[PDB]
C-alpha cells in the first residue's frame, strides 16, 4: 500500500525492490509478466517515479533474454562454437551479479537514492544491450558452426 506512504520514504521501498528484478527474481511491486519481457509497476504510484522506473527496466528485460540463451545453447546438439560462445558470454553475467551485490551493500547505509541508481548501472545497460542483441540474432536464423562465427565478425 504505497498510497499511504510519503514520497521521500516510499522511494526507499522501490529501490530495494527494483534491486532484485535486475537479477531475475520477481519483485514486490514491480512484478514480471508471463512470456521480450513485459512488466507491471503500480496502479497508484507517483508519476515522477514510473517514468523513471521504465528507464531502468530495459537492463532487466535485456538480461532475461541472455540468461535463457546460456541455459539452452549449451546443449551439445549445437556445435562446438555455440558452446564456447555461451561460456564466454557467462563471465559477463558473473560480473553483472557482482555489480548488483555492491549496490545492496551500499543500499544499507541509505546512500543509494533512485536518481543515483540510474547512473550506476550505465555500464551494465550498454553491455547487457549488446549481448541481448547477439543472443536474439544467432537464434533468429538458426546458426551453428561457421555461420555463428561470421555473425560475430560483422557485429567500447
Amino acid at each position: 500500500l504505497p498510497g499511504t506512504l510519503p514520497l521521500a520514504s516510499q522511494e526507499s521501498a522501490v529501490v530495494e525492490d527494483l534491486l532484485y528484478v535486475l537479477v531475475g527474481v520477481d519483485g514486490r511491486y514491480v512484478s514480471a509478466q508471463p512470456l521480450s519481457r513485459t512488466f507491471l509497476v503500480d496502479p497508484n504510484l507517483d508519476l515522477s517515479i514510473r517514468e523513471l522506473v521504465h528507464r531502468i527496466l530495459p537492463v532487466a528485460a535485456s538480461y532475461s533474454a541472455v540468461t535463457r540463451f546460456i541455459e539452452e545453447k549449451s546443449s551439445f546438439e549445437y556445435g562446438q562454437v555455440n558452446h564456447a560462445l555461451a561460456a564466454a558470454m557467462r563471465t559477463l553475467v558473473k560480473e553483472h551479479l557482482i555489480l548488483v551485490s555492491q549496490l545492496e551493500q551500499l543500499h544499507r547505509q541509505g546512500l543509494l537514492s533512485l536518481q543515483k541508481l540510474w547512473f550506476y548501472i550505465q555500464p551494465a545497460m550498454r553491455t547487457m544491450d549488446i549481448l541481448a542483441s547477439l543472443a536474439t540474432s544467432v537464434d533468429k536464423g538458426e546458426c551453428l558452426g561457421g555461420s555463428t562465427l561470421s555473425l560475430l565478425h560483422d557485429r567500447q
Binding site: 560480473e95 553483472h96 557482482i98 551485490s101 555492491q102 550506476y120 555500464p123 551494465a124
Partner: protein, 123 residues
C-alpha cells in the same frame, strides 16, 4: 650455447606480447651474466645444509639427501648450482585460514564502491 640461453628464456616466460618480451628478457639474462664474470669442495656445502635439516627435525630426509650424493659419485659443478638456490593442530589451522582467505577475497568485492573490482566496468 647461444641457443641454450634462448630455450632457458622460454621456460621462465609465463604462458599467456610473447614475441618482444623474449627479446628484452634475453637482455636481462646477458646484462646479469657478465656482472659476476667481471668481478672449496662441493660435497661439504651439502652437509652444512644437511646439518640445518636435522636441527629442526626431519632426520630421515637429511639421511636421504646424503644417500643420493653418495650414489651420484659412481656433474660436480651441477650440485654446486643447486646449493645456491601438532600434526593434527596444523590441519585444523589450515582449513581455518582458508575460510579466512575465502570469505575475505569475495567480501572485499561484494562491499566496495560500485564498479571497483569489476573488470567490465573498467572499460
Amino acid at each position: 650455447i647461444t641457443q641454450l640461453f634462448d630455450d632457458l628464456c622460454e621456460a621462465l616466460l609465463p604462458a599467456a606480447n610473447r614475441k618482444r618480451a623474449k627479446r628484452s628478457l634475453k637482455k636481462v639474462a646477458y646484462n646479469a651474466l657478465f656482472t659476476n664474470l667481471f668481478q672449496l669442495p662441493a660435497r661439504n656445502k651439502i652437509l652444512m645444509l644437511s646439518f640445518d635439516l636435522r636441527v629442526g627435525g626431519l632426520g630421515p630426509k637429511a639421511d636421504r639427501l646424503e644417500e643420493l650424493v653418495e650414489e651420484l659419485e659412481a656433474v660436480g659443478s651441477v650440485l654446486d648450482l643447486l646449493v645456491q638456490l601438532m600434526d593434527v593442530q596444523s590441519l585444523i589451522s589450515r582449513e581455518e585460514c582458508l575460510c579466512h582467505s575465502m570469505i575475505q577475497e569475495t567480501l572485499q568485492v561484494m562491499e566496495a564502491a560500485p564498479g571497483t573490482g569489476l573488470p567490465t566496468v573498467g572499460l
